[PDB]
């Protein structure tokens, strides 16, 4: 049988200056499974971090297309979720900062 776990939908966080600036404002950015949806991300985040989430926003980003000696490559395309926590505001200490 298959054991469904909310953690199989959240892959990794996004480490960047824009993400950190949002982090300061209690908005966390994750890289999620490409065929997820906002409600599913909401439920998974609440279960995983035992916190109350206000809203989620998603965006799809196509992979860059690089030159090589062999020919043309193409990196993996990703979907991101920008997740905002409620006024309760318990930080995600496991984000690693």
């Amino acid at each position: 049988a298959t054991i469904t776990d909310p953690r199989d939908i959240i892959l990794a966080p996004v480490i960047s200056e824009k993400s950190y600036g949002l982090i300061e404002d209690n908005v966390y950015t994750f890289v999620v499974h490409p065929d997820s949806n906002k409600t599913q991300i909401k439920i998974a985040i609440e279960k995983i971090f035992d916190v109350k989430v206000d809203s989620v926003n998603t965006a799809n980003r196509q992979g860059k297309r690089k030159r090589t000696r062999t020919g043309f490559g193409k990196r993996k395309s990703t979907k991101r979720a920008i997740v905002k926590l409620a006024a309760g505001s318990k930080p995600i200490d496991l984000f690693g900062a």
């Binding site: 776990d5 990794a12 480490i15 496991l94 690693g96």
Partner: protein, 64 residues
């Protein structure tokens, strides 16, 4: 890693709980590596093979 021989010595309940722990640890390791604080890279591979082994023994136990 934990041997399949000692993996077959548990019931479906503890097998599922161990699978849940494996999935959680994989989550934490992925976040650790993304933040760049994971020195031992092979933890990811070992936990992945562990999840696979637990699934395999579960399927075999169901079948025969």
């Amino acid at each position: 890693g934990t041997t399949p021989g000692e993996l077959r010595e548990l019931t479906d309940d503890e097998l599922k709980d161990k699978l849940r722990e494996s999935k959680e640890e994989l989550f934490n390791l992925r976040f650790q590596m993304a933040t760049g604080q994971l020195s031992n890279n092979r933890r990811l591979r070992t936990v992945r093979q562990e999840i696979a082994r637990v699934y395999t023994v579960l399927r075999e136990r169901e079948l025969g």
